[PDB]
């Protein structure tokens, strides 16, 4: 429909590149070489016919011949050289177009990928995020196959059949056009019908094979239980049954393919025999001459070869079309959150976080935020404490605008968040994840990831302040090693130290931490507490802690219960008033 | 070498199956149809030559072929009928042989699986499961492809070229044999060389695409940290770099394939043109060569077609040979533990387990079994307690003879383990694993797995006694549902109850348990303890328990420390003597 037209137009735009001339030149060369190859391929049997007729008459009063070629040996040499020229033209065409095909594939894949990171995370959380690369790869392969086929096989064969039909309609009677048209029409319709029939058999084969492999894996993995009793009496029988089903499916597929091939051969053989016998009648009558039989045979045989893979190319074209449709469906996906055009840049004159009756529900069945109204002063450290249902994990998401607030407003530095560019707030906010992930690269790059275009002395002094430099010096190579998976293993405390180094390199105005739960010694806990205190020395900070013992360090404490505020203030006055926070101590510290 | 001869002989033995004639007849039919198809294919151009010669002479010498065909139209009809007959013979041959190929592949796969499922447990630990299934599938595909190719393409093309070179070098000059020999020799050597060079290029190509896909996965899965800062920055550039590498490799591969194709085309074109020119010289000289130029052209062209996939078939044959070698390497693997020829079935008269200074070490650098010599009376309950390093998890393996004792003696009912039939002890021992795995089948099958060929009422009463009938009555469907993966989840207590019901159905003479650690309420704990007591009411038992609160239920208790015995006897005398068991209670029960 309209979507298909849009996809075709987009593909044409990504194939033309009007800005540069090299690709236009290459496309022109491709079409030129295609036409030249087809013309030479048609002209070869004419040379063979001329040679045969001349030899037959010897044992030809023409202007062109007897001057360019002195003897029939020259004509046969020209036959060979014309075949070679046709092959060389096909060579050049396929290489020249393949280059541009690869270029456009690369451009399309990069565009889709870069758009994929632009979309919000509610999209990513919906699915498994591992099949997206599968779709990308499948669509790239589909683009490659469809372009290569549509430019190398479908068009050249149409040109070939057009030339054959035209050159037989002329120079002969009109019956040859009827013969070739009917033959190719019946051939095409038969091939399409049998392919549509065989697809079901192939799909039946694949599922049975996959089931047999899955049963084999399940049987092998559970070795000890199978060896505990009933040793091998039962499992081999069921594996044999699955193998028998696979065998039956394969046999049926092979039989159907054989039938298809036999039908195609019959159709083309009867077409060729009818053409040659009619030519023989013509020669016997006296209107024609020997050699036209040879020319007709050779020309029909030349036409035969490209039409031998019609079923395979049709099936693969259908599959590639479906895959291309899916990949382009990944695009043109809207974003729930967007930035207004009239937005104002964010100014940082001293962070003043203010919340005013924020309501939110990730799923409408359950509401997890109920009118939170906490206010963070300038240069003060606040803490959020509660249970799992207190909804503590979403506060940083809201402050970073991962999920837009259903109702209510936020004053950051006396400014609303909705009508400012998200880039400024994303650049002015630093975060410490619960479980930081280390990239499959060197340590220095991971430390530098906090802020690109940074000098080496900066990251060196940041690591020194984080007190990780001494730990780095113990590795086999200084400030360089494969870390993460498929490499050196780094401790969780060291991992969160790396995360602290990143957020210190970024040097933001507001920091948010989460204090991930881990089994840590007292000395390391004190060291990381000192590091965090140094990080939040002169910045507005909002902390959430799983372990309350670390939460007394903040100036002010707010307790959240079931998505609603209960009490606020320092811990000592919470003892004095014996509020909910006191009961939180009662079952925590005892 | 010798292994290659062995695998070829084994494959031939599987392919023949002299016992049943239904496969000998099929093989004979396959060879007959192959020979007939090749004969007809070579004979096709001769009819065209005869028709063309007769037609040219018409516009007379009698070769005594006027009786079969009255007019040249009959010969031209015979041309097509011979082509159709050749195609029919080919497809009959391919179907008839594919049947036997699909039989032998299944037989080989089942045999290899059954043998692989019989090796020792040490081999299964060493190799990563799933790799075995991958090797099995790859080798099966290798068998299928190598048999199909070696019977459908390599042999028929050799016959075709031999018979073409036999039709030539007779009825013509001797130079035709030289041409059709050296041309095909040069063709083969050139194709092999360029095929090796291209396969090196392709092996270089694949890795770049794999790396690009892996990087896409890694970049996408770690979305939140990328969105925290420097979003859509360095990642897009790196992905561009990887796609650029892949594009360069693909372009190089395409160019290499193009060059190979052009070389093959030019070689065959020059061979064909030389043969044509020599035949033209012959016909002009006035020799017996008259109008048979078309015969030579058609015969060489027929020979050309099968030789257009030599590189692909060679590369795939090499790969399939490697995979076949891998599969047949999985076979002929010795088992560490074997049963002696003088072994006898074990007779039970009341289990008496006796240990005599058993020494064992899984890896020689660390010894975990050091001379344990406990003796279990008839119809008594013995408990083993200790720490993680005590080695409590291997006594059941030794008594079940998963491994073998390095130096020691095991006396069961006054009989030695080593020189008795192992099937008897496998059948006379029942075990309760820590984490039993429920098969992805119906619940009734999983319960019946304990003892095959068992009546449904026995299974029903066994489930009822295990106090599971009430629980299993509460699923939406009774006695039939999908359980385990891809099905409804089953509780850990329910899973343990299923295992207990299974081992109750087995009804052995000696039972061993492990008391897997799991959170559980008091009522269900008492219920499963009562069930275990009922199971071990009148049988010798070897209990090991993570929770020591359940250990005094047994009659006698033996404590193990660092793979050595410390004290033995009931708990009251352990308290009286104030042995290690007192410390176990003090730092365990407090
Ligand atoms: N160019 C090399 C030959 C190597 C080559 O080109 N190999 C082909 C294999 S096409 S193999 C494709 C084949 N097609 C068919 O079988 C068509 C059957 C149809 N129904 C009919 O009418 O006959 C098929 O897959 N059938 C499945 C089935 O049997 O069910 C290729 O694509 N190479 C790519 C590369 O080298 O990079 C040379 O000349 O030396």
Author numbering:
A (entry chain B), B (entry chain A): 117 to 175, 186 to 716
Authors' own words:
The ATP binding cassette (ABC) transporter of mitochondria (Atm) from Arabidopsis thaliana (AtAtm3) has been implicated in the maturation of cytosolic iron-sulfur proteins and heavy metal detoxification, plausibly by exporting glutathione derivatives. Structures for Atm family members are currently available for ScAtm1, the bacterial homolog NaAtm1 from Novosphingobium aromaticivorans and human ABCB6; the pairwise sequence identities between these homologous transporters range from 40% to 46%. These proteins occur as homodimers of half-transporters, where each half-transporter contains a transmembrane domain (TMD) followed by the canonical nucleotide binding domain (NBD) that defines the ABC transporter family. The translocation of substrates across the membrane proceeds through an alternating access mechanism involving the ATP-dependent interconversion between inward- and outward-facing conformational states. Using single-particle cryo-electron microscopy, we have determined four structures of AtAtm3 in three different conformational states: two inward-facing conformations (with and without bound oxidized glutathione [GSSG]), together with closed and outward-facing states stabilized by MgADP-VO4.
To further look at substrate binding, we determined a 3.6 Å resolution single-particle cryoEM structure of AtAtm3 purified in DDM with bound GSSG. In this structure, AtAtm3 adopts an inward-facing conformation, with an overall alignment rmsd to the ligand-free inward-facing structure of 2.9 Å and a corresponding half-transporter alignment rmsd of 1.6 Å. The main difference between the two structures is the extent of NBD dimer separation, where the GSSG-bound structure presents a more closed NBD dimer relative to the substrate-free structure. The binding mode of GSSG in this AtAtm3 inward-facing conformation is similar to that observed in the inward-facing structure of the GSSG-bound NaAtm1. The binding pocket for GSSG identified in this work primarily consists of residues from TM5 and TM6, with additional contributions from residues in TM3 and TM4.
